[PDB]
């Protein structure tokens, strides 16, 4: 399935080249510009655990998730991954725990040492 495919076929987008965040572009977005640090970014997402459980989805809440890019308001994988996206793009991210919640995990759904899968759509970005 999609988690396996991005695990085996994704591109390493980390600056360290440590395979901690792999990405596949599923839907090409618009033009060439990516957001800049500090921009308000609006995303839709779906997250799955390695046991197959869906642990979150913005679609189901009927509102996008909004954060300021590059400020550590989200897991590292999201700061790194969204920074690579164009407006309108959909990608898959496969995130090792060092770029997510590490040994701590995150109650209720995310265990310790969890590799996470996400589908992310970048709806918009603005300064």
């Amino acid at each position: 399935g999609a988690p396996a495919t991005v695990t085996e076929q994704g591109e390493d987008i980390t600056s360290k080249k440590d395979r901690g965040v792999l990405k596949i572009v599923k839907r090409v977005g618009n033009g060439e510009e990516t957001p800049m640090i500090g921009d308000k970014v609006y995303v839709h997402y779906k997250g799955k655990l390695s046991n197959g459980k869906k642990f979150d989805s913005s679609h189901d809440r009927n509102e996008p998730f909004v954060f300021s890019l590059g400020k550590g308001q989200v897991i590292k994988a999201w700061d790194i991954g969204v920074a690579t996206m164009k407006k309108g793009e959909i990608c898959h991210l496969l995130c090792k725990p060092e770029y997510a919640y590490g040994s701590a995990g995150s109650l209720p759904k995310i265990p310790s040492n969890a590799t996470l899968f996400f589908e992310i759509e970048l709806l918009d970005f603005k300064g």
Binding site: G47, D56, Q73, V74, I75, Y101, K109
Partner: peptide, 5 residues
Amino acid sequence: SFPFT
């Protein structure tokens, strides 16, 4: 909580 931290 997710999707924060």
